[PDB]
Design an enzyme around this catalytic site. Sequence first.
Site, PDB file in Angstrom:
ATOM      1  CD  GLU A 110      -3.309  -0.445   0.259  1.00  0.00           C
ATOM      2  OE1 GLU A 110      -4.268  -0.819   0.874  1.00  0.00           O
ATOM      3  OE2 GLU A 110      -3.100  -0.167  -0.542  1.00  0.00           O
TER       4      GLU A 110
ATOM      5  CG  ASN B  72      -4.494   7.443  -1.682  1.00  0.00           C
ATOM      6  OD1 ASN B  72      -5.549   7.100  -0.996  1.00  0.00           O
ATOM      7  ND2 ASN B  72      -4.167   8.272  -2.457  1.00  0.00           N
TER       8      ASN B  72
ATOM      9  CB  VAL C  12      -6.873   4.978  -4.424  1.00  0.00           C
ATOM     10  CG1 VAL C  12      -5.965   4.706  -6.736  1.00  0.00           C
ATOM     11  CG2 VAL C  12      -6.972   6.717  -4.317  1.00  0.00           C
TER      12      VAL C  12
ATOM     13  CD  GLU D 107      -3.133  -1.303  -4.249  1.00  0.00           C
ATOM     14  OE1 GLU D 107      -2.486  -2.128  -5.395  1.00  0.00           O
ATOM     15  OE2 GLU D 107      -3.507  -0.066  -4.763  1.00  0.00           O
TER      16      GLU D 107
ATOM     17  CG  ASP E 129      -0.147  -2.964  23.186  1.00  0.00           C
ATOM     18  OD1 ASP E 129      -0.494  -3.581  22.290  1.00  0.00           O
ATOM     19  OD2 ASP E 129      -0.085  -1.229  22.366  1.00  0.00           O
TER      20      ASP E 129
ATOM     21  CG  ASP F  45       3.925  11.389  19.127  1.00  0.00           C
ATOM     22  OD1 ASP F  45       4.065  11.504  20.301  1.00  0.00           O
ATOM     23  OD2 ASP F  45       5.121  10.094  19.169  1.00  0.00           O
ATOM     24  CB  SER F  46       3.305   7.616  16.015  1.00  0.00           C
ATOM     25  OG  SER F  46       3.637   7.073  17.454  1.00  0.00           O
TER      26      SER F  46
ATOM     27  CD  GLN G 137      -5.037   8.356  19.709  1.00  0.00           C
ATOM     28  OE1 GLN G 137      -4.226   9.217  19.085  1.00  0.00           O
ATOM     29  NE2 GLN G 137      -4.688   7.453  20.486  1.00  0.00           N
ATOM     30  N   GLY G 138      -3.662   6.036  14.791  1.00  0.00           N
ATOM     31  CA  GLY G 138      -4.267   4.911  13.324  1.00  0.00           C
ATOM     32  C   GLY G 138      -3.112   4.616  12.980  1.00  0.00           C
TER      33      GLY G 138
ATOM     34  CB  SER H 246      -2.745   1.231  16.969  1.00  0.00           C
ATOM     35  OG  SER H 246      -2.970   2.478  17.874  1.00  0.00           O
TER      36      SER H 246
END
Length: 223
Positions: A52, A54, A57, A62, A84, A171-172, A174-175, A177
């Site tokens: 991946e 985009n 699209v 892929e 985790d 930083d990293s 949400q999303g 993860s």
Amino acid sequence: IVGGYTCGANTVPYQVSLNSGYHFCGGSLINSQWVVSAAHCYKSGIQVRLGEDNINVVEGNEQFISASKSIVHPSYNSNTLNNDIMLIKLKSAASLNSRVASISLPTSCASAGTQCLISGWGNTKSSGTSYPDVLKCLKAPILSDSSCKSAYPGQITSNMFCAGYLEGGKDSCQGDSGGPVVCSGKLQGIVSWGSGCAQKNKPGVYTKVCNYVSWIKQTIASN
Ligand SMILES: N=C(N)c1ccc(CNC(=O)[C@@H]2CCCN2C(=O)CNC2CCCCCC2)cc1
Ligand SMILES: [Ca+2]
């Protein structure tokens, strides 16, 4: 990723997107049949999306493959996010190519100060919300454990490390993860948690992958 840059299509060929109708987590390809992600990304009905850039699209490189099995770390504690980490088996082997590649596991842990690459499709804003459709990248160093524990008293365990910038802005988020932290060619972290995103004196906290290599190797060999 907040404060990062567009990686460029397929320049992080081990980066996966976990999809359950929508992107919800990153992951890292570690061989043709297995992905490692965060335990907090566990859910039923995962499709792994490899190759991946985009994510909204179809661009031509892929591979979409359903997961056949998920294995959350036996010791994962969702309250504290200790351990985790999770393994995901692909129903069929990925066809490995220059745009769909595995990342090596560590032979030892990375030192504080080592520079790493963090990537993902998570929020790019520190205040508010905007989700990119192409993959974002961030160069960030591992922080000392002392700096890490001072930022998050009593909440950091031996299975976590901090990485990023104490002054904020990078930083990293949400999303992101479950996504990779790669240092010197090895997967050393998994995007796990933090306080907000890119806030001052609240760096990113990552699962310390070097503590799990034996578990990973033995688990994949028996499943
Ligand atoms: N680097 C960052 N700023 C960053 C921040 C947050 C995330 C996404 N992760 C999360 O939001 C996770 C997963 C579900 C509960 N999460 C939490 O972070 C909830 N907080 C935990 C639980 C409290 C005790 C110490 C652990 C932190 C990813 C990255
Ligand atoms: Ca795509």
